[PDB]
Symmetry: D2
């Protein structure tokens, strides 16, 4: 019985046709591209957002235009009650849930000496606690054989980024969550993995990329990209949202069936 092949042989194993995915914080940035790409691959997508209402509506319309159904659901991951409600709403929209991408997140910088309890809590509540409860509700609502992909960062393991303990720590915790949740969620045949991107061009990158660059405060946007391209990748280019979306789709497919409890680094070979 253990000789049975799981899923189809050939390219069909990469297909996401007919699947239903939910992506947190899909109104913009990496989450937006995850939504777009899952859609291009045949998924109906639930676009979650907390603040970016108009942007979320635009993503939903873009997904439909590409040939897949989509809908948006407002929910703040810092509020568990919101997460619970979002999932209940989500399953009524398309009738089921096959894939959940926990992507929502915020960044923070500051020397450990200057960190306040309020800032620590702000970051942990969204990045760690928020992902945990999105994971909890995903387990309850996911189809047998489903998928849960959490959002980490190269910072979980990075050794040279100063004034970054809070954000880095909020992300490192996700790697442990993946290993432990992969055990529990396997009782519904759900795989649990964490993607760990390097710097990726989004609103977050624009806001804080210079903080990762010694003496980079006065660099132009052009110099910033040149630095990210040369310093963080032997491939000599900047990371883009699609670079992450592609890996998420692999994990979400039958091709990622034997990949569970893992951290997948997607940083172009960066050393940080």
């Amino acid at each position: 019985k253990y000789d049975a092949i799981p899923g189809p042989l050939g390219p069909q194993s990469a297909s996401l046709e007919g699947k239903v995915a939910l992506v947190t914080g899909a109104g913009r940035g990496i989450g937006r591209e995850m939504a777009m790409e899952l859609g291009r691959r045949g998924c109906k997508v639930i676009v979650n957002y907390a603040n970016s209402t108009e942007s979320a509506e635009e993503v939903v319309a873009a997904i439909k235009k590409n040939g897949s159904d989509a809908a948006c659901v407002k929910a703040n991951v810092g509020v568990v009650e919101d997460i619970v409600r979002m999932f209940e709403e989500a399953v009524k929209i398309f009738g089921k849930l096959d894939i959940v991408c926990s992507n929502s997140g915020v960044v923070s910088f500051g020397h450990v000496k200057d960190v306040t309890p309020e800032e620590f809590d702000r970051v942990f509540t969204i990045n760690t606690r928020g992902q945990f409860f999105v994971a909890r509700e995903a387990y309850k609502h996911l189809e047998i054989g489903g998928r849960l992909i959490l959002m980490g960062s190269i910072t979980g393991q990075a050794k040279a980024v100063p004034k970054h303990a809070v954000y880095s720590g909020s992300k490192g915790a996700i790697e442990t969550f993946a290993r432990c949740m992969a055990i529990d969620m396997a009782d519904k045949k759900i795989t649990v993995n964490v993607v760990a991107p390097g710097g990726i061009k989004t609103d977050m990158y624009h806001a804080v990329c210079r903080e990762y660059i010694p003496n980079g405060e006065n660099l132009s946007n052009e110099e910033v990209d040149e630095y990210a391209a040369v310093q963080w990748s032997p491939l000599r280019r900047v990371g883009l949202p699609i670079d992450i979306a592609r890996v998420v789709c692999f994990l979400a497919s039958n091709d990622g069936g034997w990949v569970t409890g893992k951290v997948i680094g997607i940083d172009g070979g960066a050393c940080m």
Copy 2:
């Protein structure tokens, strides 16, 4: 220029149509399935073998039957001259090389006190040195934007397998090779990664699976599979060659473009 999208948006990014791949030790086991699956996804495949002539010929025929071209080439990876010859022959057969899967390998068990220089050398010459020179020749012959996938094992990082220092060490070195080669080979835009499978049902698994099981010398083949399924995976099943082939195809496609210098564990969440 840093805003340019690398490759196609959508499912086409997972396509291997028109690519040419070379797989070492493709006459049987994991290498055979890699060759078969790469062929199913559109690759013309060079089926390398060292001893399994008839099996290699069967794989080539099956690939052609499935709709793709293939050819087998003999080469013992323990002889660098053989590796050099194989790559020269490969490019003559198909004109180019896009993907190289360094798969060939041998297993070994023995308490450290009993390991002989001959056994150590036998294992390292094939598993470590062999992979290193297959990688060197791959770099020389690969198309710009090519792919190199090396074969590691859960043993590179495993913490409870006794009498296994030689084999485990030969595989652990591969993880470092992936990180270092990713830097060098990036000058030709080639990504370099290592897949690390847990136990997979093959001839190798049949020969030594019991060695990974305390007091498993007398277990029936049925009990061995049951042990592997329950002990090594929360998903409760045994790993199969297709589980690995699928991940190799992902890495070999445009979807794996930003994944370089990484170790991808494919063990169903095993703890060993």
Copy 3:
């Protein structure tokens, strides 16, 4: 080509003494959180035996904390206890202010206080998640913050992680494991910032260690271990979790902490030190 042969420069200066004196903690002052019992208690005891004056922090175990202080004094060192709950930042701030007043300085800070929890991810409540993270992660973070502010230049900060931070086979453990996993990242990041005061920051990651905590939940780490006797539990821990065939003890951890706290640990910073007798979990 730069042909000049190697030369002794300013970077050739030896940090600290050569020989066994490099392992000495004589004259140092250490603060250990949750030192009234368990691993924290042994850290305090051993640090005391090696010459440190110790600040024994406790949150509830008042009597045990007084016992530890008395034992350290009896052994030949000075000690004092300070009550503070790490789930309250104001308590941590006050603890450190009182601490430096006691002996005049702080050389070593061992962030040890913690709580354990088990539960399938599906059953975890926000209150339980918060209970664990507030003590194990947030608590250690602010103990670290205050430690940085009060520590002598060249000081030492040792955080308490666990084998669970990296463990792959413990079911129903994501909350506790995640709270400890975050500590490994903190060690790497804090080692950078705190180096501006020449302070090293590392995290010790113990496997199972015989304490009140181990007593309470060791069976949770053992498949079908609910009905195992205390003796059977120890035998299991000894054989299953260590090729060395014995159970981990508080002294096993305290010894490594003393190494990191000494001059011998000067070049070890931003690291995770596993102390589990070679366990695979």
Copy 4:
């Protein structure tokens, strides 16, 4: 429910002495490969200072080896040099037999000998690969094998790795890095086997350390570093590779080796200990 409260059992026995004596190496015998110079020389020197009688192995540096032996004796401990090339298994076997004849027993073995190499993967020849792997990997493996056979019950085996085993940004370094990365796996796997004689097996992973090797190739780790003066190279190493802002020294590694070799390292086995001042390479 098992209601019997925690009590002492056979597994509660304290391994070794409580207090500072646990760090003592007094009366121990240690063997260090490649101890005529560099890191190996300092391991031998420091081990000697802490009370060990030392077997100083060398392959070529005869005079240097003799100087180390004389210095250890002058410092108060006995020592003797033994010539053996780790690329020849027969030499290794002979070296261990001679070592036990000299001092009667062997408590600690430090596998330190190594060579470095640089080259883009495209240019690496089988001879170069074999040259590096025969000494750094195969050599260390057979030194470990013989060490297991001759070491005292409760002994110590410390292998020499490098930050390169895990490094992510050093170009043209696959061969050397790989030869060192294999050592980390060896530590995990040998810790299991060797535990049958209560021997702990660990690997130390240094960052750049000022020695003849560092002097020879440090510029290779520095982009556009070919024309930097010796002073400039040290300044770069100090600032780029450590938040602590100084260069790593042989004594930095020797101290950690002494800790691992002592009773304090008793519960530390199958581990990789990074000693690089918090470097990111």
